[PDB]
Design a protein around this ligand. Sequence first.
Ligand SMILES: CCN(c1nc(Nc2ccc3c(c2)S(=O)(=O)NC3)ncc1F)c1cccc2[nH]ncc12
Length: 270
Amino acid sequence: YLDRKLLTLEDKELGSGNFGTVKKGYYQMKKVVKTVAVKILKNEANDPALKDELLAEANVMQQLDNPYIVRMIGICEAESWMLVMEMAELGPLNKYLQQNRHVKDKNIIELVHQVSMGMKYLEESNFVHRDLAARNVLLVTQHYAKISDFGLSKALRADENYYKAQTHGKWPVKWYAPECINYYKFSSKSDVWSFGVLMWEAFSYGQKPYRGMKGSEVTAMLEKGERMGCPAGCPREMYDLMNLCWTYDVENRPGFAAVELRLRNYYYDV
Ligand SMILES: CCN(c1nc(Nc2ccc3c(c2)S(=O)(=O)NC3)ncc1F)c1cccc2[nH]ncc12
């Protein structure tokens, strides 16, 4: 738990949501001050499900340590409940690509490879992300991406490779694999499907997937074996990798170790 007197928040808001606000701030470390992004719960954190999601996200972040995952500084209980993270200055990947339409193919491949390295680590650590979308990739620099938003993330049981939800909740269905929608089962292979959607978003410069379709229509499209087309100018090898991520059968779909290998821009052995 952090010291409010060591935290300073900017008057301006960095972003906003139904949970409350996101503010840029500064936190006093051993010697230097560190730039932070702070999620601040609305109405003094009176929504108990908001408070519980904040604490669950913090509990997951405390266990993670990887260069391609946003680092948590901690929780601050003061005027409201705050979750303090190391600032990724350039913000969400989808907004960045919407605003920077000339980012080169090699650079997009570099960034999605970094996401695959963080996901390979999460898979090895037996956590499922469950909200892997371009909006949840944050840029430290134009050449360094980190994964964020672990609000739906789960630590897998020791005897299973999936988290079983009781039924369908309010979910980012356009990023979910068929086994998620049909059987409520979430594995690292389910995150690989989401990663294929994230890839499609990155090469479509932050366009939304399955434009104009209802969730039920997406499910029927996928069950028919249909998939989104190749984004204009997307390298064929990257579109082929999206299609492999969108393998219907969870057993035949690659895991992140296999996907990360396919995103390397150097010779290697399997
Ligand atoms: C996306 C908000 N965000 C961060 N945000 C940034 N940078 C950042 C930088 C710029 C902008 C934004 C965020 S915005 O709010 O989406 N709009 C502009 N860096 C690290 C961050 F951790 C967060 C803060 C606290 C808890 C969090 N959980 N998941 C994300 C998150």
